[PDB]
Design a protein around this ligand. Structure first.
Ligand SMILES: [Cl-]
Lengths: 210, 206, 210
């Protein structure tokens, strides 16, 4: 068939489908895109694969990306709202447009941290940074940065809550379980599937600190 | 062929296209899905057909479902925001995840009442109940229950208005024309195509 | 055959793809629809091509229309929220529904002015008028009219800002560069790719006034 995915429940690691060199993905992060057919490359829109001078998409490890999520690249796509016209004369081929200026403006890289959950059909605008552990609700339109462990939703996306207390977020950012050795991760599965941040932090501290 | 539907103006009854046993639909309700290609089955996302221990979708009679509407099932899909990580270790095959716990949690059935109009590309969240006669605006993201004859819109969806007065809604919920024999409906078409709720209510009692 | 567009960066003029006679489009306006596959005709939903008695869609020149934008036609599609039931008995073939009344109500034409930028996957509701120079943010749901040079976004779309001052907007509406002779447009390319509305206005005045 045309569907890249064999099952609605099928989630395929990002690094097994990405071909665009300007998409940088960490391990284990996955995309479950059955309901939109295409692989993850086409979630990332208007990203030139051959140019090193445009905004890149960087995704950390252990991210969950729902079906049909969109990452908008290419900044303003050549449209300048502060110029007289938003029409991209520079990029349509008409000899009457020869003296046009190039209206393309970059927005900066889009950076998704570790352990980020992106709900189905959410749209990430250009240049957005999403902190570790954040949650983007389904159908969000994310127009500005999202803090670590922050939950946002709506269009434009706005703050809903933080997943944990400030001291709990500080502990998680210090211990950075996503960067632990494979052996530590495997040994920690039961703890990571729980709310026991303090226990895991104290356990990590005795093992990793000196 | 590219499309389940022959025409943009073609609406196909739900009970002529649904195959998932966990989707229960009443008569005459239809889906007009030309602009998204697939039949109604694929509107209903992540619903295991073979299982009886998962949230079901129930839709009443006389509902109008616009193109590309989405009914989210499978509850939290194995992601626990209250756990340290939302990553679904239990459901990804890596030997390092062998001791993970199953984060799946049910949300409850999604229940759509009778005579509900769902606008194109609305998304219904898991476990939501939508009362009889409601209207879901196009592109709504319905995150909580909707009352009978309530109009909602936006993302998240929020109250816009009620279609009728409190007493008129009481009369409609009491007479429940959707359950009338179709011979009755034939004689009632002029009333149903009008705002004369009290008039029909009086005829019903008589 | 998979995609009407060869490349994500491909923008094809509306007047090279529209076949529906109830869609009227000006020159140079384009649709870049790679990420949704279909040509512009299928952006315009429920628009009977053969009837002269239904709401039409009119699009001025120099518009930029992003992928998957939706223009909702056919008004209420036969559903009357003020009737006892929204179910369109008139349009379902059933001898028990013979005495049903036609619930279809028109909303008026959808009119989109010159030089309008419509972001990807915005939805334009029936009967909406969008003034010259407006910007519709990505994923907007436009339920009401939008003023000239107004920026709107969200669902339902709401006022964000005006692009230019009241003086500058009045100047642009008066000078109407989109209607200029081709030779004037060509000579004006650099000015159009700038913020100097008043400078262009004064130049146009000296050249056009009597
Ligand atoms: Cl939205």
């Amino acid at each position: 068939a045309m569907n890249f995915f064999t099952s609605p429940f099928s989630g395929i690691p990002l690094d097994q489908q990405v071909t665009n060199p300007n998409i940088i993905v960490g391990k284990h992060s996955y995309y479950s895109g059955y309901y939109h057919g295409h692989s993850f490359d086409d979630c990332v829109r208007y990203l030139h694969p051959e140019r090193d001078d445009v905004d890149k998409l960087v995704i950390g490890s252990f991210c969950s990306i729902g079906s049909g999520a969109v990452f908008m690249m290419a900044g303003n796509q050549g449209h300048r709202s502060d110029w007289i016209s938003t029409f991209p004369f520079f990029y349509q081929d008409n000899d009457n447009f020869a003296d046009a200026r190039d209206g393309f403006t970059r927005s900066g890289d889009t950076i998704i941290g570790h352990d980020v959950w992106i709900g189905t059909e959410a749209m990430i605008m250009p240049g957005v940074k999403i902190g570790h552990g954040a949650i983007i609700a389904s159908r969000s339109v994310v127009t500005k940065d999202v803090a670590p462990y922050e939950v946002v939703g709506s269009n434009p996306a706005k703050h809903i809550k933080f997943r944990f207390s400030d001291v709990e977020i500080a502990m998680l950012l210090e211990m950075a379980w996503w960067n632990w050795p494979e052996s530590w991760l495997k040994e920690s599965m039961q703890s990571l599937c729980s709310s026991d941040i303090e226990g895991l932090y104290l356990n990590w501290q005795s093992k990793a600190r000196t």
